[model samples]
Target: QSMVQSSVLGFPRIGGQRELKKITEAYWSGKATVEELLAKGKELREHNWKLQQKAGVDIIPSNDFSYYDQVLDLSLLFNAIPERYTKFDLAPIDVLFAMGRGLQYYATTALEMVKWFDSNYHYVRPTFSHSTEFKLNTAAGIKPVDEFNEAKALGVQTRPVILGPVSYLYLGKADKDSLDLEPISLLPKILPVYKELLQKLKEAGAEQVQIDEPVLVLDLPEAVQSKFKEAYDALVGADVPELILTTYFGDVRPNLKAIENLPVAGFHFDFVRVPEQLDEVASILKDGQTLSAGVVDGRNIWKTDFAKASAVVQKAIEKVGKDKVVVATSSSLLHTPVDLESETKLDAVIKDWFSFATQKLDEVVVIAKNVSGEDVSKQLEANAASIKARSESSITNDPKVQERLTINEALATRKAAFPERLTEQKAKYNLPLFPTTTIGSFPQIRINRNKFAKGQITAEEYEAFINKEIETVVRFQEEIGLDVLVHGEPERNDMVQYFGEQLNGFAFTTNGWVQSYGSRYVRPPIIVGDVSRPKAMTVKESVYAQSITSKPMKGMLTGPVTILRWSFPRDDVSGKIQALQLGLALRDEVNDLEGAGITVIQVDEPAIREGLPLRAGKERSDYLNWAAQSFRVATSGVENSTQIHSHFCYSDLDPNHIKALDADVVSIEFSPNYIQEFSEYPNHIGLGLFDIHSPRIPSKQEFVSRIEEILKVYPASKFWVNPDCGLKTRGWPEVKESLTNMVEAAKEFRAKY
Candidate 1:
């Protein structure tokens, strides 16, 4: 019999009740003191450790908890603080939050944050200085060693977790002045810090350290591939804790040749994503080398099928023997909800079909039991019952939704080409050259709907207040001389969640908060069944706003793929089927908005790129085809004069995929200035003049400079100007200042045209 162990990549730092977000925000608002905040953080960490220990996790990850992000914590620990953040003289924790959420005290914008792999979790990117020096901070109190020791003091053993040196350097960006220097060149300086940290972990009595080098999953150049051996050579075999080098999110087979000879103790692969790699990896390991099989799904909310997960684990045992195998989650459990038991509002039938972070720990242990030749028939039978019920449930089947899925291809296309659509749009709106507008949302920082929550105000009062706020926004847009007006989504709590509430086939929770970024959280709705629109989702607000403004109003709707991507989708149906259902639902709203005199419609697909598969091959192509087709189905019902405009939060355009959307006008974030290179694209394009993610206000001349750069490639008629994203988090003062300058820059360019 094999003594196989079970482990988790990481668990949620936010408490089961979301006490972390509550206290952290309270401290930010001055409602709690530093001592109170520290006490609460300690409380949450202790609870998480004890919960994992009781749940039978053989190796719980420490140092994964963060008030902001693990990457920023590591950056500060390595003394890589940016010059902009050091001037505040705040405490170390304050400095961390400043980098994650920006410091209003210094009028500073936060460091750039991006999606972590394909998950909605975000991490702060490390910024490098021109004269950067890498040195370990021996005095910092939040290193992996400290976290492991703290958990030990509570009688819980832990595997210290830290970002690997190669991935840390790979994920970093150069400072504005350091653009000439390659970030990888600093790897020589960075390795010493890792060596020092590993030595500290060994001193602290850690038996194993989990070094996450997620960059190995990416397509690497020969130069980076060569660094694998050079980097790992310094950390191992030198009184350092035994290293289990971990890689997740995709297969690392492309870099397998480079890593096969490295002297690491073990290797981890995401069997959930690339199961075929098991046979190849099983054949490559030398004697005494272990293989950690990631058998459970970590990025989703579904319960694991014990029968199937056990088969994969049994295969690993058959190849490597049970003594050299470990079963684990594919990635960190941070991407999943905290627990399913806390959800009191969920139907018992559907709730049985799911598992969250805490329950997933149980699944890992059960898989291990069966792999070890232990009898776990009770657990196995119960899991099989849940799987059978979910598949056979009547809620998963809807004839009406299924009927729309087989619609004609003509319903997914516009009647005319872009040239005709552009002519119709210009004649209808009588817009000026270099027309200016803000993104769909305006400043909504103070428009909280808490009164209705507390029963201090009725729904009547809530709608009245939303209307008054809309009228004020309409007046402000006219005063600022914007060419197009937005309803200023004051009535919404979130873009996708707001629509999810009104649509059928979704469930929601009051306490289900998942971190979208630092301090920013989202309650992703649960798609329980077939999705359809009972009525119009956005026309009520768009029509009311148009009643107060004379300028053209763009009806705003969240795109199909984004809606499906952002929600906790049903596992019983295919993703393509769910996407088509959502597209059909939004298609009804698009036609309804057009009927209500809303001419121009902007369907935002901010998560289109986020939905792309990490690897480049058949999986990527198949996803892009269905995703683009879903977008087309949602918006094709409108006329040419209706002006089908779509917005994306990124500018990384795939020339092959642009035509797939078939939109008349597409607006993307401004960066690299690549939209001008799409000369074959025959449509109007919008260039984002303001980056709403940053708090720093740009000068009007800066906007003019950006517009002039675009004019070099695009004729004036092909361009539209706007902010890069929604201004929901920004203050009204900055919004006013930014839009005023944005209009002035447009007028400056209009004169030249």
Candidate 2:
């Protein structure tokens, strides 16, 4: 009998030391050529494949590595390029980068990018049209078959991964002014490409193909469920390669009836997330089906409990026999850091209690060994000791943080109604109509940070440099006639990491960076214990900026939901508990800012929607309640006269969530596309007029045109003007030009009134 095999859905594409980031950035700046960039990507993929092979992964995946995103890669392979991208006579890689980041030289913006599942990773939203055609473009092609051949030549047989056809269409949207047709209607035209791709893999001597159908986890419509059956029937036949259908991020029990009798070799389930469906799934498997049980987590850094995982695997084995079962990670390790061993600064005690992507692969192998009646008592015992030490450690129990979590319903509510708050805020500041402002951050240069890291500069010198930048920014805003101002956050490395460094119960890593979108990366602080504020975190920055300028300075803080969502939250504690702890900490910061005379405080919660459960039901409803209430607890401490504000980049803008947020003013990103949905809100609103994601400087006429459309639905008296998001990713010149035009556009509106 064959032993239980192990596999990973996908590994990190960024090199172990971020080799891809260096090369990709250099190429973008024209410092490197296309050949050099391809060489770097090739080297990284070869090394990643060898690492998995050495670690005993039975079914390592290929074609998961991407220069920008996997979804964009698939779009290019299928020749789904939009006309805007095709108008440029550029190379394939150049066109791909243009689609991911806009073509500034051509004055065309990028396609929309949104969060992937419930993780922080972003995927480019595919664009479809009425006249869209599906043909395999062999000129820029070689989907997964090339990667499989490359790995096979290196003495490692690998399974090729592809986004399933149904999910691909479901995730996309039809273009504006199209036939109003559903994306699924185009599937019959796209199925031949899939059949051809699968047959090519079979011809290349591939034993299996891992087709990801993650859309099953969502609350799918009947039409989509029926399309799943139709899609599989068309893609799978006698001549194609053996297919292992995979689903992750949530339970797939709801989709079982739709996909039960399909012609596939195996099915993969995420047992770590929804263990309640194991018995029901096991009982329903047909005569010759295989089961891939995901027993180790791929989303967080917590160490796996060996015995518990073994028991879960044992249940699957008892039902499907050892030969018919496999062990794997819950989902792609693209969300995790590459390795835990590279963390040199972590404490020895806590370091033993964590695992990164590489460590998770080892856990998968160990579970397989235990399933095969092999004794791994040494590793299991050590894991148990580390787990026990973490639970009983004094770090997890801070009495002060716990005390602050005690509920007082009054503390979680605002002091005044919207009209009273608006009147008090306006009377206190006497701001003008269409008050011009920014989204609370300015462009941060990298030279000062590199200097500090190299030991060529001291703390005092860094502070002096940052202060000078802030001074320049304050003067620029005043010169441009903006009604409100920001401190130009040059002191912050990241929106979340900046605050994480000031709070207790967080751990740092020198090299634990994960990709967010494109070349942008974030090093999420590991929440190791109970969270609390040792002192005021943001007051000093806000106070200094306010003291310098008479204009009201907005005190910026990452909201509790964003802080928890962006960080590596603890697996043992409930997210609600951690959010409450962070909310109380932020409450103190807001009150301190108010006491220090900072009247406008903008707490950004761009990640609140990022953590919402994929399937919308009781689970999703419960999450929005706590997430919105957490925002209330964080900002409700200050007086209504202070004018508390908030910002969101990604959310469905549900009315219940908006009402519960309870902020006095809210700024939303609505530049590339305006949101008519928010016109019903009764409070003050900020409409983002310029798209910060693009490098091109928007014309004054464009801003005026967008504002006209927005003002048609929202009253001018209730509107504020700002950019769609922060300017951190932009250059100083681009920011200057954009804001200058933005101010001119706002002035036109004020003049007309």
lDDT of 2 by residue, 229-279 (tens): 778888888788888888888988887788877777888888888877788
**Least well predicted 10-residue stretch by lDDT in candidate 2:** 394-403
Candidate 1 residue spans exceeding 4 A from truth: 28-34, 83-91, 103-109, 394-408, 422-437, 444-448, 478-483, 549-551, 571-574, 654-656, 668-675, 678-680, 688-753
Deviation (Å) of 150 in candidate 1:
2.0
Candidates' RMSD to native: 3.7, 3.8
TM-score of each: 0.90, 0.89
> How many residue pairs clash in each candidate at the backbone level?
0, 0
Error of 2 at 307 (Å): 1.5
TM-score of 1: 0.90
Candidate 1, residues 1-753: lDDT per residue as tens digits? 227899899988888877888899998888989999888988888999998888888888998888878889899888777877778667777888888888884453788998888888889999897677778766547468777888999999899889998889888989887788777878988899888888888899898988999888888778777888989988897689888889898889888888888888898889987888898877778858888999887878889888888899889988988889999998888888888888897788888988888899899988888888778899999999988887676453555765554446887888887788878878888899888877777765253388787788888888898899999899988988999888888888778998888888887776667788887777888887778999878888899999988898888889888899899887556678888889999999999999999988988777778888887888789889888888888998888889888877654667567667878777767745365556565677786777887759999999988888777778887888888877878888888888999999899888875
lDDT value, residue 559 of candidate 1: 88
